[PDB]
Design an enzyme around this catalytic site. Structure first.
Site, short mmCIF file in Angstrom:
data_model
loop_
_atom_site.label_atom_id
_atom_site.label_comp_id
_atom_site.label_asym_id
_atom_site.label_seq_id
_atom_site.Cartn_x
_atom_site.Cartn_y
_atom_site.Cartn_z
N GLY B 47 5.42 45.99 58.44
CA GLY B 47 5.90 45.83 57.07
C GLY B 47 6.53 47.08 56.49
N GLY B 48 6.38 48.22 57.17
CA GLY B 48 7.01 49.47 56.75
C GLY B 48 6.23 50.37 55.80
N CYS B 50 6.60 51.02 52.31
CA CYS B 50 6.23 50.55 50.96
C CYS B 50 4.86 49.84 50.91
N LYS B 58 0.37 53.20 46.12
CA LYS B 58 0.72 54.02 44.96
C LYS B 58 0.52 53.30 43.62
N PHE B 174 -3.76 57.41 51.09
CA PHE B 174 -4.05 56.06 50.59
C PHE B 174 -5.19 55.34 51.31
N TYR B 190 8.85 62.77 42.90
CA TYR B 190 8.04 61.72 42.33
C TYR B 190 6.72 61.48 43.07
N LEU B 215 11.16 67.31 39.58
CA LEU B 215 12.00 66.12 39.80
C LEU B 215 13.50 66.40 39.94
N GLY B 282 14.10 61.81 58.26
CA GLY B 282 14.54 60.64 59.04
C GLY B 282 14.19 60.69 60.51
N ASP B 286 13.56 60.30 67.79
CA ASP B 286 13.05 59.37 68.82
C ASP B 286 14.02 58.28 69.30
N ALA B 331 16.95 49.18 50.04
CA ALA B 331 16.80 48.90 51.46
C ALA B 331 16.74 47.41 51.78
N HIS B 457 9.66 42.55 18.10
CA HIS B 457 8.70 43.34 17.36
C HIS B 457 7.32 42.68 17.41
C1 LIG Z 1 0.73 36.00 11.30
C2 LIG Z 1 2.21 36.14 11.54
C3 LIG Z 1 2.61 36.80 12.70
C4 LIG Z 1 3.92 37.24 12.84
N1 LIG Z 1 4.30 37.90 14.00
C5 LIG Z 1 5.61 38.34 14.16
C6 LIG Z 1 6.00 39.00 15.32
O1 LIG Z 1 5.16 39.47 16.07
N2 LIG Z 1 7.31 39.45 15.45
C7 LIG Z 1 8.23 39.23 14.45
O2 LIG Z 1 9.39 39.62 14.59
N3 LIG Z 1 7.85 38.55 13.31
C8 LIG Z 1 6.55 38.12 13.15
N4 LIG Z 1 6.18 37.45 11.99
C9 LIG Z 1 7.27 37.02 11.04
C10 LIG Z 1 7.55 38.16 10.06
O3 LIG Z 1 6.34 38.58 9.43
C11 LIG Z 1 8.58 37.72 9.02
O4 LIG Z 1 9.70 37.20 9.70
C12 LIG Z 1 9.04 38.85 8.11
O5 LIG Z 1 7.91 39.52 7.60
C13 LIG Z 1 9.91 38.29 6.99
O6 LIG Z 1 10.39 39.33 6.15
P1 LIG Z 1 10.93 39.07 4.64
O7 LIG Z 1 11.42 40.39 4.09
O8 LIG Z 1 12.02 38.04 4.63
O9 LIG Z 1 9.66 38.50 3.81
P2 LIG Z 1 8.23 39.24 3.56
O10 LIG Z 1 7.93 40.26 4.64
O11 LIG Z 1 7.14 38.19 3.42
O12 LIG Z 1 8.38 40.02 2.17
C14 LIG Z 1 8.53 39.33 0.95
C15 LIG Z 1 7.73 40.05 -0.13
O13 LIG Z 1 8.21 39.71 -1.42
C16 LIG Z 1 7.13 39.28 -2.24
N5 LIG Z 1 7.62 38.36 -3.29
C17 LIG Z 1 7.78 37.00 -3.23
N6 LIG Z 1 8.26 36.58 -4.42
C18 LIG Z 1 8.42 37.65 -5.23
C19 LIG Z 1 8.88 37.78 -6.53
N7 LIG Z 1 9.21 36.70 -7.26
N8 LIG Z 1 8.92 39.05 -7.08
C20 LIG Z 1 8.51 40.16 -6.38
N9 LIG Z 1 8.06 40.01 -5.08
C21 LIG Z 1 8.02 38.78 -4.53
C22 LIG Z 1 6.16 38.65 -1.26
O14 LIG Z 1 4.88 38.46 -1.81
C23 LIG Z 1 6.26 39.65 -0.11
O15 LIG Z 1 5.49 40.81 -0.32
C24 LIG Z 1 4.87 37.01 11.84
C25 LIG Z 1 4.47 36.34 10.67
C26 LIG Z 1 3.14 35.91 10.52
C27 LIG Z 1 2.72 35.46 9.15
C1 LIG Z 2 4.28 57.45 48.77
C2 LIG Z 2 5.63 56.86 48.51
C3 LIG Z 2 5.80 56.11 47.35
C4 LIG Z 2 6.92 55.29 47.20
N1 LIG Z 2 7.06 54.54 46.04
C5 LIG Z 2 8.17 53.72 45.87
C6 LIG Z 2 8.33 52.97 44.71
O1 LIG Z 2 7.37 52.79 43.97
N2 LIG Z 2 9.43 52.14 44.57
C7 LIG Z 2 10.38 52.06 45.56
O2 LIG Z 2 11.36 51.33 45.41
N3 LIG Z 2 10.24 52.82 46.71
C8 LIG Z 2 9.14 53.64 46.87
N4 LIG Z 2 9.00 54.38 48.03
C9 LIG Z 2 10.18 54.46 48.98
C10 LIG Z 2 10.10 53.29 49.96
O3 LIG Z 2 8.82 53.26 50.59
C11 LIG Z 2 11.22 53.39 50.99
O4 LIG Z 2 12.44 53.54 50.30
C12 LIG Z 2 11.32 52.17 51.89
O5 LIG Z 2 10.04 51.87 52.42
C13 LIG Z 2 12.33 52.42 53.01
O6 LIG Z 2 12.47 51.29 53.85
P1 LIG Z 2 13.07 51.37 55.35
O7 LIG Z 2 13.13 49.97 55.90
O8 LIG Z 2 14.42 52.01 55.36
O9 LIG Z 2 12.04 52.30 56.19
P2 LIG Z 2 10.46 52.04 56.45
O10 LIG Z 2 9.85 51.16 55.38
O11 LIG Z 2 9.75 53.37 56.60
O12 LIG Z 2 10.37 51.25 57.84
C14 LIG Z 2 10.74 51.86 59.06
C15 LIG Z 2 9.76 51.43 60.15
O13 LIG Z 2 10.33 51.59 61.44
C16 LIG Z 2 9.45 52.34 62.26
N5 LIG Z 2 10.20 53.05 63.30
C17 LIG Z 2 10.77 54.30 63.25
N6 LIG Z 2 11.37 54.55 64.43
C18 LIG Z 2 11.20 53.48 65.23
C19 LIG Z 2 11.61 53.22 66.54
N7 LIG Z 2 12.25 54.14 67.27
N8 LIG Z 2 11.25 51.99 67.09
C20 LIG Z 2 10.51 51.06 66.39
N9 LIG Z 2 10.12 51.35 65.10
C21 LIG Z 2 10.46 52.53 64.54
C22 LIG Z 2 8.71 53.24 61.28
O14 LIG Z 2 7.55 53.81 61.84
C23 LIG Z 2 8.49 52.25 60.14
O15 LIG Z 2 7.40 51.39 60.36
C24 LIG Z 2 7.89 55.21 48.20
C25 LIG Z 2 7.73 55.97 49.36
C26 LIG Z 2 6.60 56.78 49.53
C27 LIG Z 2 6.35 57.35 50.89
#
Ligand SMILES: Cc1cc2nc3c(=O)[nH]c(=O)nc-3n(C[C@H](O)[C@H](O)[C@H](O)COP(=O)(O)OP(=O)(O)OC[C@H]3O[C@@H](n4cnc5c(N)ncnc54)[C@H](O)[C@@H]3O)c2cc1C
Ligand SMILES: Cc1cc2nc3c(=O)[nH]c(=O)nc-3n(C[C@H](O)[C@H](O)[C@H](O)COP(=O)(O)OP(=O)(O)OC[C@H]3O[C@@H](n4cnc5c(N)ncnc54)[C@H](O)[C@@H]3O)c2cc1C
Ligand SMILES: NC(=O)c1ccc[n+]([C@@H]2O[C@H](COP(=O)([O-])OP(=O)(O)OC[C@H]3O[C@@H](n4cnc5c(N)ncnc54)[C@H](OP(=O)(O)O)[C@@H]3O)[C@@H](O)[C@H]2O)c1
Ligand SMILES: NC(=O)c1ccc[n+]([C@@H]2O[C@H](COP(=O)([O-])OP(=O)(O)OC[C@H]3O[C@@H](n4cnc5c(N)ncnc54)[C@H](OP(=O)(O)O)[C@@H]3O)[C@@H](O)[C@H]2O)c1
Lengths: 481, 481
Positions: B47-48, B50, B58, B174, B190, B215, B282, B286, B331, B457
């Site tokens: 499987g190489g 990764c 990792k 590992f 890295y 890095l 590399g 071999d 790769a 949000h």
């Molecule tokens: C529980 C819940 C979860 C939510 N989760 C998300 C989410 O995760 N992501 C997201 O994007 N949105 C979420 N929302 C939606 C988001 O809260 C609303 O879209 C956003 O707050 C609307 O903004 P607004 O300014 O139009 O009204 P509001 O934020 O309600 O503001 C209006 C304000 O004016 C006041 N007001 C009303 N009439 C009068 C007046 N006559 N005179 C003076 N003040 C007055 C009100 O009492 C209030 O304080 C969620 C809503 C609820 C209820």
């Molecule tokens: C610790 C570490 C962390 C990493 N983290 C990430 C990451 O999170 N994200 C990411 O995208 N990449 C990561 N990588 C990089 C990634 O592992 C390599 O880019 C990828 O495995 C390369 O693939 P490859 O097929 O070219 O070689 P390899 O996966 O190494 O495969 C080659 C294989 O061929 C064998 N071989 C060699 N010579 C011969 C031969 N003559 N005959 C038969 N077999 C042979 C080798 O022994 C090996 O088994 C990480 C690498 C390391 C070491």
């Protein structure tokens, strides 16, 4: 009037718009008020939904759940870790809230420093150029030249006895005094899925209740793989089910009666907590939009490609906007771009296409572009190619983790350029993986460049570059395992 | 002769080439032999590099080290984790090797099933069409029509007393019987960086010895940030230093005398283990290449754009190839493409440009495209733009992790299309983040699409889409923290 721009709402879009507008010379005010949740009365600082009750607390709970798995896997690698570990919910809540409050303060200082006049008051229109601000002191203020509506929405409640009284919503969940315990999650959108996900991960017992389907609007093959993923980890699902009522019994426990909508099966169960994750409703009500003559499309405000409303001088941005992606960075960027067109002499409009998203489920699901079904509907099945595969994360091997739901898919144009239409991934760090591909799609990513992009080895991201099996072929998507 | 194709070497390139060639009708043989390391005599299956002694072991050691941090962070989130945990080196080695041997067996079965004749023997040329295979039985075999050389390299040893006797290399590390203990890592490429990284993470005491720079071949700003990153985590570096000798003292301990090359400072220290990570040589030796009349460029084989050697009928691929990226997927793909041109009627050549890579250091560093210095040298400083930033991972906040080395950079064309030349990231899951951007670069990623790609949000990947501060500006790269 008194201001070049008044911004109504201090969330993701509001604050982004306010800050950008001042950067380009404008005299701007930004209003933000946070109405306390009915029952429990939960309230938070400035910065909007994401920081306080959205993306951020959500991601932190998900991370806490993720870190528990990491603790359990560490033993497989030779770490002498103890098996019986348990999270402290109050300690977790504490940490999460500490971070949020620190961000709140920094946000307030940043706004003052950037000269954005923040008003802690509720704004409502008197006139297309005149707004009534209602401060804490019962005090009021008026008047401005242009308007940006960025008011967002709030969690919906079912019209059902006991709902607002005994049930909670995402708003409450992230600072919950009481330990969640056994919890019913009503809603299979991302918020309900994500919450159930991290509730199981932190030692509690969630159930997901589904009215119809899992993750509507998302690719349904992917949505079913995420659901099955959750069941694998012990999260049960109640399919085709609607809640009927919840009642506080002299017991402390909560009885929920429910009903199958396909069958007519009336049934019941007892939970410690009931979470309504049934969508969010735009805060148009409190604005008195008719006073400004602004038209509404039912809880949302329709805007044109420039975020203008039917009133030239008034704009809407973020969640209240009709039928656009409801996410924070969408809101942030649309708000910034808007402020830059009004005051920076820019002609750059918002691009609402190919917005990437992540569902932070236990196994995360990210995607960007078209679902398989939308691409088939749009272009025809025979002009579509789907490349797909099951894959095996390097880090799943030693702990012998399930790879059953580790699935990857690219939806593409079949002939010609072979343009990629969509990318879907279930697995580790799904948003970290998809983000760069979302950029690639935006640069015109084709199958040929995708497949000749050299992989980074060993990663799960490189799986996309390894895609080679098509669905059309009918060949096994599990390749020399 | 007897074969259409003989492949010399069964690693990433060799096996990929062999399997692909059979897929296209060829009669093929593949030779693989693994020469046991001098001293210790370490050996492995097919499987190489990764699978057996690279990417895979990792990454598994890195993951084991990562999981220990996760254990220490879990406590901040409310998990009742115990502080004093320690890995078992023999248990870790065991797990790693178990996975590798399982992969070895599957690889052998897959080769037989695909009808690739695997020969467990060492191949050497007799003739441009004739090879001597040397089997275990001292047995030999001959002859074929075309040749693919994919022999790779093996770890280098310093020409210094005690080196091959007392020191080890990545090959040994590992599967090490002895516990590493206090270890000297000679080499700041890295492999040396990654090993030092996970040796510290698993409770040992590494030192990195640098001859000149950290890095080489990588962006030097980034390379210094990774080194400083490692020092932060307690890994010391011996700068401008060359080893002089190592000796086994009656003590069990290893005394290493060393020398500053700028100064003339002769110094010494005592270690349990000495790791030579000083490059790989590399295996051309071999092969008896002169018998086939194949020219060598010193431990490496120069090839043309089609991987052909100066002998039309003989090819080289993977690590032995002169001055191309030495990575597994490079790769694998070059080997596959080669086999496909010989037997599949393909005209697709290997693309060796913009190959992404990850350094799996404690804080990972991924990159793709040009370093800052190469882009400046190539185009001129005033035609170059660098967008950069320090950022804060969502998951770093609660555990209060250092964000000092969390740094991000995009090297780009300054005017016109503003084409991106290079992307560099230090942080969590760096290869998961960069992979999709490497694809984006390959689709012609510009700054404009980068910066108008909506973020996912809350993620660290979205930081790239948030880049806005240029070095030319001189503005603080830490943006409203
Ligand atoms: C529980 C819940 C979860 C939510 N989760 C998300 C989410 O995760 N992501 C997201 O994007 N949105 C979420 N929302 C939606 C988001 O809260 C609303 O879209 C956003 O707050 C609307 O903004 P607004 O300014 O139009 O009204 P509001 O934020 O309600 O503001 C209006 C304000 O004016 C006041 N007001 C009303 N009439 C009068 C007046 N006559 N005179 C003076 N003040 C007055 C009100 O009492 C209030 O304080 C969620 C809503 C609820 C209820
Ligand atoms: C610790 C570490 C962390 C990493 N983290 C990430 C990451 O999170 N994200 C990411 O995208 N990449 C990561 N990588 C990089 C990634 O592992 C390599 O880019 C990828 O495995 C390369 O693939 P490859 O097929 O070219 O070689 P390899 O996966 O190494 O495969 C080659 C294989 O061929 C064998 N071989 C060699 N010579 C011969 C031969 N003559 N005959 C038969 N077999 C042979 C080798 O022994 C090996 O088994 C990480 C690498 C390391 C070491
Ligand atoms: C999607 O994305 C868009 C926005 O989503 P959203 O914010 O509305 O919700 P969402 O967060 O995406 O999901 C809410 C979930 O709860 C369910 N639900 C909604 N109302 C319910 C009710 N009162 N009783 C029981 N379950 C209920 C929904 O099922 P359903 O599939 O039945 O709506 C949905 O699965 C929608 O237009 C929809 O198409
Ligand atoms: C890079 O990448 C290419 C391939 O890298 P590689 O496989 O050769 O090595 P590598 O794995 O990239 O790195 C080996 C490291 O060890 C050092 N080193 C090499 N020989 C040494 C010696 N005998 N004594 C002490 N230290 C030594 C190198 O320093 P140096 O910088 O001095 O070479 C280098 O930092 C090279 O061409 C180089 O340019």
């Amino acid at each position: 009037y008194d201001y070049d721009l008044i911004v109504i709402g201090g969330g993701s879009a509001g604050l982004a718009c306010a800050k950008e507008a001042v950067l380009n010379g404008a005299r701007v005010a930004c209003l933000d008020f946070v109405k306390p949740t009915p029952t429990l009365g939960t309230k938070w600082g400035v910065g909007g939904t994401c920081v306080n009750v959205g993306c951020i607390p959500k991601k932190l709970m998900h991370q806490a759940s993720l870190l528990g798995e990491a603790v359990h896997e560490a033993a497989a690698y030779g770490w002498n870790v103890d098996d019986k570990i348990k999270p402290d919910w109050h300690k977790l809540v504490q940490s999460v809230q500490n971070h949020i409050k620190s961000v709140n303060w920094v946000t307030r200082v940043d706004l003052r420093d950037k000269k954005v006049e923040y008003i802690n008051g509720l704004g409502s229109f008197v006139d297309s150029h005149t707004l009534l601000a209602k401060l804490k002191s019962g005090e009021r203020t008026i008047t401005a030249q242009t308007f940006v509506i960025a008011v967002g929405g709030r969690p919906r409640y079912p019209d059902i006895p006991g709902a607002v009284e005994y049930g909670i919503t995402s708003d409450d969940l992230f600072s919950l005094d009481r330990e969640p315990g056994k919890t019913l999650v009503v809603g299979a959108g991302y918020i309900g899925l994500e919450c159930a996900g991290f509730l199981k991960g932190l030692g509690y017992e969630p159930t997901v209740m589904v009215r119809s389907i899992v993750l509507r609007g998302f690719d349904q093959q992917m949505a079913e793989l995420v659901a099955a993923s959750m069941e694998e980890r012990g999260i049960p699902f109640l399919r085709k089910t609607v809640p009927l009522s919840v009642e506080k019994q002299d017991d402390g426990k909560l009885l929920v009666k429910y009903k199958n909508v396909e069958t007519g099966e009336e049934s019941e169960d007892v939970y410690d907590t009931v979470l309504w994750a049934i969508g969010r409703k735009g805060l148009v009500d409190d604005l008195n939009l008719p006073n400004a003559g602004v038209t509404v499309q039912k809880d949302k405000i329709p805007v044109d490609s420039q975020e203008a409303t039917n009133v030239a001088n008034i704009y809407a941005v973020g969640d209240i906007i009709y039928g656009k992606p409801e996410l924070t960075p969408v809101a942030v960027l649309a708000g910034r771009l808007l402020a830059r067109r009004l005051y920076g002499g820019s002609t750059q409009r918002m691009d609402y296409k190919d917005v990437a998203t992540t569902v932070f489920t236990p196994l995360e699901y990210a995607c960007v572009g078209l679902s398989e079904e939308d691409a088939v509907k749009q272009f025809g099945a025979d002009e579509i190619e789907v490349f797909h595969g099951y894959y095996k994360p390097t880090e799943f091997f030693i702990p012998q983790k399930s790879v059953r739901y580790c699935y990857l898919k690219a939806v593409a144009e079949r002939h010609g350029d072979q343009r990629v239409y969509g990318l879907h991934y279930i697995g580790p760090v799904a948003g970290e993986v998809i983000q760069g591909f979302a950029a690639a799609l935006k640069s015109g990513l084709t199958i040929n460049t995708l497949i000749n992009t050299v992989g980074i080895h060993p990663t799960t991201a490189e799986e996309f570059t390894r895609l080679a099996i098509t669905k059309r072929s009918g060949l096994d998507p599990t390749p020399a395992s």
